[PDB]
Amino acid sequence: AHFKEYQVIGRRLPTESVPEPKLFRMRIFASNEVIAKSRYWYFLQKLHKVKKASGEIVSINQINEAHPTKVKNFGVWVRYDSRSGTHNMYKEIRDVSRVAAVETLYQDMAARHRARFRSIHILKVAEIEKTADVKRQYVKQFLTKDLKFPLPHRVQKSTKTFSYKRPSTFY
Amino acid sequence: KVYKVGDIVDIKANMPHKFYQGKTGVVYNVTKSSVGVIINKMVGNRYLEKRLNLRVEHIKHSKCRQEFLERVKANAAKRAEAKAQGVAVQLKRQPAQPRESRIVSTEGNVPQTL
Amino acid sequence: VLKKNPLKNKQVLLRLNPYAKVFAAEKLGSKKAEKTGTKPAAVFTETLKHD
Amino acid sequence: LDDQWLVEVDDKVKGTDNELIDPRTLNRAERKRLVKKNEKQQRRNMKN
Amino acid sequence: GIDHTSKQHKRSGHRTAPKSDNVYLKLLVKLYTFLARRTDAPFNKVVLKALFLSKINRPPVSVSRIARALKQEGAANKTVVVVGTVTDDARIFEFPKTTVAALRFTAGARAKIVKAGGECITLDQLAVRAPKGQNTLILRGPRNSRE
Amino acid sequence: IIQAKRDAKAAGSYYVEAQHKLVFVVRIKGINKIPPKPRKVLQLLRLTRINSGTFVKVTKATLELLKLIEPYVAYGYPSYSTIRQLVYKRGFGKINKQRVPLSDNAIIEANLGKYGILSIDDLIHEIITVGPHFKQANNFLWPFKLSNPSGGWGVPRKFKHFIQGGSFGNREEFINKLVKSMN
RNA sequence: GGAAUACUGCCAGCUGGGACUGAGGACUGCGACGUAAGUCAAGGAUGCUGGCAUAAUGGUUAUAUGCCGCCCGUCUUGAAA
RNA sequence: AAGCUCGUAUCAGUUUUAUGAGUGUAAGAAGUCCUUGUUUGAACGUGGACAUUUGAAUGAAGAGCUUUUAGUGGGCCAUUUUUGGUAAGCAGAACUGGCGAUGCGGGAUGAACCGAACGUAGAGUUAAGGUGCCGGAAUACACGCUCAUCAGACACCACAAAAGGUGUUAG
RNA sequence: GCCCUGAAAAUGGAUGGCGCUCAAGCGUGUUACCUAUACUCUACCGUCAGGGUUGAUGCCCUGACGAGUAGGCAGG
Ligand SMILES: [Mg+2]
Ligand SMILES: [Mg+2]
Ligand SMILES: [Mg+2]
Ligand SMILES: [Mg+2]
Ligand SMILES: [Mg+2]
Ligand SMILES: [Mg+2]
Ligand SMILES: [Mg+2]
Ligand SMILES: [Mg+2]
Ligand SMILES: [Mg+2]
């Protein structure tokens, strides 16, 4: 859906003579908290040897974008499952929010790589602070000074079946 | 290790009839060599009684009623104590309950992002 | 002879729950909470903003 | 069959006093009876 | 659809009505149905249940059996009730003085009871005398003795 | 609970709330082609038809039943408004093996007065806080016969997990929205 | 530093439009508004009004239109095959 | 189908707990306590007594015992375990589902595919599948890919060598 | 990832047809909408069950159910 970013902090259940287990925190992109907790337990079992029935969720908090009205360049480091193994991938997305950048990446994976949400892992989303560090041409072409471009061949949407005038595509 | 008729035993091998691994039965025949075990097996929609003959080393005493006997003794002791001193006593077993609330402090245990 | 829903029929609501009149009169469905000035800890803020 | 860890008891043995007997012992006895029968047949052939 | 746990439209059964066409028997059934409903009396329940049984399930009760039952201590003055036929018995030579209520009496049994000095009454007269079945003793005949 | 969360954040700690003691379960699939063990568990939980719902007290004995019937039910944690509306609109008692509408407090007082429950509000209280007589009150309540959701199920295919874009499994707090739609 | 708004949730908050239904047939009950007698939307529809008073509604019959519908019985897993 | 009894009676294609195996057993009147009799210990008992806090959860109003008789029996398909394999198909065991006896919605059409099981109707909402026209329902919105000298709208098996291409896009 | 080759016979025919190319194709996301003898509410028929009752195998009140070959029982 429309993605939201959460922090999930969990731990093992405290035991006798071994109190205060260490806390672990993950940043999870998900549509709701149920999916976020499911992803957290999945990744915790995949990385550490912690099971959901042996652990507990200490906290889950939504993380809002700090400056949602500022256009930013994002580098997204992801990995996906395959029969050969786990493959890295780096993409660059120009957007005003981390969650919208993640949604764009997921749509791009569904379109090109034929990938799925459960098979795509979001490893890192980092804002590119300097314009010189952007290294994809399809993003660099929008960083040029005094950028202008027209929108030729405009198609207007008619609410009526029949039109009494030949249409124009001017803009 | 002496087995008598009516004992509850577990069938545990130290090739044929591999279906009878982990089965629990009642001793009905005891010889100087082998032991006879009654097994109730599911056939269709009914249970049938079958006689199995086993070596002594391939069976052992089953402890499936040990918890029942110990719980009966503990219940008798607690009932005697609560009859001696008037108090409301709960004797039935209860399933595991959902846990209550708690406070988890980050006092030296600052959460670490993985 | 006929089932009437207390969620729609006010007479049946009052018959089943006498406290409904008090609830409506005191407007307990829109009770204001007392304003407090508690602030979260710096460790909580840093953890929330941490990557 | 003597070394077999588990022998199922035949249905036809029930109802007779030979139910308590070890089936391994019963089969060893049957084998020895067959061997002695073969020996008696050999002795009969030698007499004839 | 629904996943039924039990059979549907299952009859309770329990012998609701008698299979006979005797108008007098139906009148007795009516009277004891009224008594069983309006008294909450277990005696009336038992008599109503016995009035529905078939002939092979209502075996006869002998006068010698009645005398043996009256031989019990404290029962020498109770009213014997048999839902069925009371038959005579020539194997007994002493019969007590007592009141017996039954559906039918054989001629010999009625003569024996009257000669001993008691009375043979019907179930409606029993209902009038003891509406709740006070001081009554219900006797049933042997079942498995027939084959 | 709200202030305990705030006071924990001020002290640098995290307030972990107690686990839910109550769930509401709605059967979502029909009676054709159900495997025998889940079928038996659905009968034991009184979900004999599609869109039948019951309250379940959460223990280790009931969590495994819910896990067994997970592909065929939608369940979650009901709120006070959801429970109140369910009991008020679709609440029926089981009196002498008959389904009796709860249109007067005298019915509830006559049938559950031995347990200290005198009104429909007391019944709702015993449901929402799992008390000593939760079993008796819950079994007194006839299983709720819900309609189909008024706005639809919200998904193209129901019979996937709620996590994977379907309808079954544990949806936690969203069961309130679903049950209010189906009420 | 001071606010607002979005999102999620609650109200025994208010109010407009539309559709199907009116089972029951003296009273009894639970309630509400009322000092009060009484009143009520509270254990299932009443009130006011118009036209027609007959082929008008309705039925039957012949047909037209839209969609659905393979020829029965028997015997064979199974049958249009 | 008939009787007899009992009916907090009898239980359960389920879970939990304890204990086995790499699904089995057990969870109270077919109990328990004291008292010391039978062949200093096991195993059988004399007499008295404790209950509706009588021994986990959930569900269930019918359960048990005697009698008593109609129709039937070597079927197909599919899933999960397991043993042997063939050019390839597969063959032998264990268990469980669907169908025969069964209409309804959808998959254009259909023995085993998806949904759903059926008194007569009204209103509302849905499942699976769909919403250019046939055809009820957005020529909806949004992000990308593709141009096929008979593309594709498919069962996910095979052709298939993950082979060939100066097609195109992203890594 | 998508596209082309990756072998094809023999009456004229098939993504069901028409047709469709920033799709009416493919992957994915968010909503709205259509409609089953299914679900919810009501009425009516029948069956079963539980209560009441000094044309009584009738009458009154309440609740739940309704597929079916061989075969069984019951009322007509
Ligand atoms: Mg039905
Ligand atoms: Mg709608
Ligand atoms: Mg759908
Ligand atoms: Mg007309
Ligand atoms: Mg047709
Ligand atoms: Mg149209
Ligand atoms: Mg070929
Ligand atoms: Mg189409
Ligand atoms: Mg699409």
B91: nt with nearest C1' to CA: H55
C28: nt with nearest C1' to CA: G11
CB contact under 8 A, F120 and C16: yes
CB atoms within 10 A of CB D8: 14
DSSP annotation string for F120-173: HHHHHHHHHTT-TTHHHHHHHBPPEE----TT--SSS-SSSBTTTTSSBEEEET
Supply the Cα-derived Rg of chain C in whole angstroms. 22
> Protein B85 CA to nucleic acid H62 C1', in Å?
42
> Protein E3 CA to nucleic acid G76 C1', in Å?
35
Ligand nearest A110 Cα, by number? 9
Co-location of A48 and A59 in the same domain: yes
Among partner residues A23, A26, A48, which is closest to B109 by beta-carbon distance? A23
Phi, psi torsion values for B102, nearest 5 degrees = -160, 165
Scanning every residue of chain A, which has its alpha carbon at the shortest distance from the alpha carbon of B113? A25
Co-location of A44 and A104 in the same domain: no
**From the Cβ of C43, is strand I under 7 Å away?**
no
SS3 readout for F38-97: HHHHHHHCCCCCCCEEEEEECCHHHHHHHHHCHHHEEEECCCHHHHHHHHHHHCEEEECC
> Structure resolution in Å?
2.3
How far is the CA of C43 from the CAs of A117, C46, E124, F8, F111, in angstroms? 32, 5, 95, 12, 55
Scanning every residue of chain A, which has its alpha carbon at the shortest distance from the alpha carbon of F16? A58
Domain housing A86: 69-145
Tell me which residue of B62, F33, E46, B112 sits closest to A27, measured CA to CA. B112
Co-location of A37 and A92 in the same domain: no
Co-location of A34 and A85 in the same domain: no
**From the Cβ of F113, is strand I under 7 Å away?**
no
CB contact under 8 A, F12 and B107: yes
Q: Does E107 touch chain F (CB under 8 A)?
A: no
CB contact under 8 A, B110 and C50: no
Domain housing F116: 1-183
Residue A155 lies in a domain: no
Co-location of A105 and A138 in the same domain: yes
> Protein B11 CA to nucleic acid H17 C1', in Å?
22
Residue E5 lies in a domain: no
Co-location of A44 and A87 in the same domain: no
**CB-based contacts of A30, cutoff 8 Å, min separation 6:** A3, A4, A6, A36, A39
Q: What is the DSSP letter of C10?
A: H
Q: Which secondary structure element, helix H or strand E, spans residue A10, and what is its range?
A: strand A4-12
Residue A159 lies in a domain: no
CB contact under 8 A, C48 and A27: no
Pairing between strand D6-8 and E61-62? unpaired
CB contact under 8 A, B99 and F19: yes
Residue B5 tokens read as 């008729």
Phi, psi torsion values for C27, nearest 5 degrees = 60, 45
Beta bridge partners of B9: B25, B61
Co-location of A57 and A87 in the same domain: no
Residues of F with CB under 8 A from a CB of A: 14, 16, 162-164, 170-172, 174
CB atoms within 10 A of CB B114: 10
Cβ contacts of E5 on chain F, cutoff 8 Å: 43, 48
Nucleotides in chain I with any atom closer than 7 Å to protein CB: 1-2, 22, 26-33, 38-43, 46-50, 52-54, 56-57, 62-67
Residue A9 lies in a domain: yes
Domain count, chain F: 1
Distance separating alpha carbons of residues A140 and A92, to the nearest angstrom: 10
> Protein F135 CA to nucleic acid I29 C1', in Å?
44
State the nearest Cα–Cα gap between F104 and chain C, in angstroms: 6
A30: CATH: 3.10.20.10
Supply the Cα-derived Rg of chain A in whole angstroms. 22
For residue B59, the one-letter residue type is: I
Residue E7 lies in a domain: no
Experimental determination technique: cryo-EM
Cα distance between the two ends of chain D? 37
Residue E11 alpha carbon to ligand 1 centre in Å:
19
CB contact under 8 A, C47 and A9: yes
Q: Which residues of B70-92 are buried (b: 16+ CB within 10 A; e: fewer)?
A: eeeeeeeeeeeeeeeeeeeeeee
Co-location of A110 and A127 in the same domain: yes
State the nearest Cα–Cα gap between A124 and chain B, in angstroms: 11
Q: Helix F60-68 and helix F36-44: axis angle, to 10°?
A: 130
Residue F23 tokens read as 């769930």
Residue F147 alpha carbon to ligand 2 centre in Å:
14
Residue A157 lies in a domain: no
**CB within 7 A of strand G: which residues qualify?**
C 1-2, 4, 9, 11-15, 17-21, 23-24, 27, 29-30; F 79, 81-82, 84-85, 104-106, 176-177, 180
E99: CATH: 3.100.10.10
DSSP annotation string for chain D: --S-SEEEPPTTTTTSGGGSS-HHHHHHHHHHHHHHHHHHHHHHHHH-
Residues of B with CB under 8 A from a CB of F: 95-107
Residue A162 lies in a domain: no
Distance separating alpha carbons of residues F78 and A53, to the nearest angstrom: 23
Residue E92 lies in a domain: yes
Residue E9 lies in a domain: no
Distance separating alpha carbons of residues A78 and A120, to the nearest angstrom: 7
Are A22 and B109 in contact, with CB atoms under 8 Å apart?
yes
Tell me which residue of A98, A43, A31 sits closest to F164, measured CA to CA. A31
Whose structure tokens read 């429309």? A2
**Is F touching E (3+ C-beta pairs, cut-off 8 A)?**
yes
E33: nt with nearest C1' to CA: I56
Distance separating alpha carbons of residues E8 and A156, to the nearest angstrom: 66
Co-location of A80 and A121 in the same domain: yes
Co-location of A77 and A59 in the same domain: no
Domain count, chain A: 2
Domain count, chain E: 1
Domain housing E33: 14-145
Residue B47 tokens read as 């249970």
Co-location of A54 and A74 in the same domain: no
